[PDB]
Amino acid sequence: MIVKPMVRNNICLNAHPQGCKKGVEDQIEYTKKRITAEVKAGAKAPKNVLVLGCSNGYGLASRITAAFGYGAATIGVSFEKAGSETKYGTPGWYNNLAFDEAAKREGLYSVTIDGDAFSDEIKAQVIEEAKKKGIKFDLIVYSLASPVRTDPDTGIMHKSVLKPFGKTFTGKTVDPFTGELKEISAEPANDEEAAATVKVMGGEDWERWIKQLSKEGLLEEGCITLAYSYIGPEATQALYRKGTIGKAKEHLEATAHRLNKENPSIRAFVSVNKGLVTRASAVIPVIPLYLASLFKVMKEKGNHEGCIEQITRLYAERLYRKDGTIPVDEENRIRIDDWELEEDVQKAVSALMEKVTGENAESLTDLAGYRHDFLASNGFDVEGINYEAEVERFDRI
Q1: Count of structural domains within the chain
Q2: Would residue 240 show up in a list of annotated catalytic residues for this protein?
Q3: Domain range for residue 77?
Q4: What are the residues facing 184 on neighbouring strands?
Q5: Active site annotated at which positions?
Q6: What separation in angstroms does the CA of 146 have from each of 79, 143, 186, 212, 223?
Q7: Rounded to whole angstroms, how far apart are CA atoms 397 and 377?
Q8: Binding-site residues for NAD(+)
Q9: Rounded to an integer, what distance in angstroms lies between the CA atom of residue 32 and that of residue 61?
Q10: Catalytic: which of 142, 240, 290, 320?
């Protein structure tokens, strides 16, 4: 049948198999052009990489950059739903298929483990595969993105929330598909939601991954491990700084800190990345309007980045530099949101957000870019795909 996007409750339910494939291929093509012999010259390189949350976003870009930019062997872990002949798989499933197929063609070692990365079973499968091939990891990318986590020690499921503390957080927002400006709110959270959010979005599982791998002797001396995060603009501080998200990030930072203390042979960092369209963006106040404005400003300035641009820059200009350093802020965090949080960028975005109305939104902001990023995450609206051609089956390509 002809596959078109199906969005319900601000979520794209289905996925285009060929579109997802093309999306992966485009990132690979960029990486080959971005990470050249000259960029790599005189710098170290990853060899054995573990990527947790490898099927989309920053995780996918991290695996692609490591594999197709540096030639590294990668083990990827993600929790997908398989396609089947008549029903849809998750976009990450098709992405993983595209990646492994491309990696095989290049002659690269690539193994994808599908399952709950929060579980000890999945960790066991990783350790087993690593033991089998004599692999010691020198780079571990933690990019897990889930609203829920089942505690491996208790079996209790925890649900994260995106809410402030004390007062209700209210701000403008925009529907990129209709162009309508709205006013939405996030109610203040309780102690349970706060603890649960830290349980899900903090650094517990990350540290658990590291400690288990270290115990099995699967970490190379000086192994780099990163957990991706976000700080955001002043307008959203009520959530990302002082909200439930803010507490989770604080736990993430304290975790990277504790990791370095107990493993003198390791290099752990929180990597603060730029803002991007995510599954949860739609329900967050301010965020969609900010991002649409941010995309507009940064594309005009020439410093706009997507996932693959962000991560290739991360590898080339932070992790593997010719000077052998790893630049961090005053809190020992890697910052690649540095272009986003430039004063000239933030002032332009702030001025832009104040001028946005229902009549000028499509013209004043990059609603087009927002729609593309939202759709491309599921394989829709990507260049070079017919879309008027029908998909024969959904368990392939």
Answers
A1: 1
A2: yes
A3: 1-397
A4: 171
A5: 240 (proton donor)
A6: 10, 10, 19, 21, 25
A7: 16
A8: 53-58, 79-80, 116-117, 144-145, 249, 276-278
A9: 12
A10: 240
